[PDB]
Amino acid sequence: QGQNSVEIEAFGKRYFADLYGGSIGYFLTDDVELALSYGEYHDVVHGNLTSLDAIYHFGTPGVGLRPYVSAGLAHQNITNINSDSQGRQQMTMANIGAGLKYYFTENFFAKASLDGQYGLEKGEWMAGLGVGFNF
């Protein structure tokens, strides 16, 4: 782990609709990771969300718990097919989040997350879980 390491992750989040996806992340330092994520909406409508986030990790690299906080920008593409209408919408939103990543081996982690997405014109919050591998 630490600076220059890479992480691949699978996630699944539910609003409190579901979002299921993956992420690739790179450690700019021992604590700061840049991650690109992609997810598709299911179970409440079709669409997807692409996100670029900066994640600050508390604790230290290695086996154990690294809480984190994150912020980023996302682009959402939604198609809605309804009984007498349909449409498509694309939107940019700001993200803030926090969570717990537990590295139970030097390479593998499980994560529990809370994320808020905010409209930028004129928020929506999810809880989630993910798993990943750091190399």
From Swiss-Prot:
Source organism superkingdom: Bacteria
Post-translational modification: Might contain two disulfide bonds.
Compartment annotation: Cell outer membrane
Function statement: Has porin activity, forming small water-filled channels. Also has a structural role in determining cell shape and ability to grow in low-osmolarity medium.
Domain remark from Swiss-Prot or TrEMBL: The N-terminal beta-barrel domain (residues 25-184) when reconstituted into lipid vesicles is blocked at both ends.
Family: Belongs to the outer membrane OOP (TC 1.B.6) superfamily.
Protein name per UniProt: Outer membrane porin F
Gene name linked to the record: oprF
Included stretch of the parent chain: 25 to 184 of 350
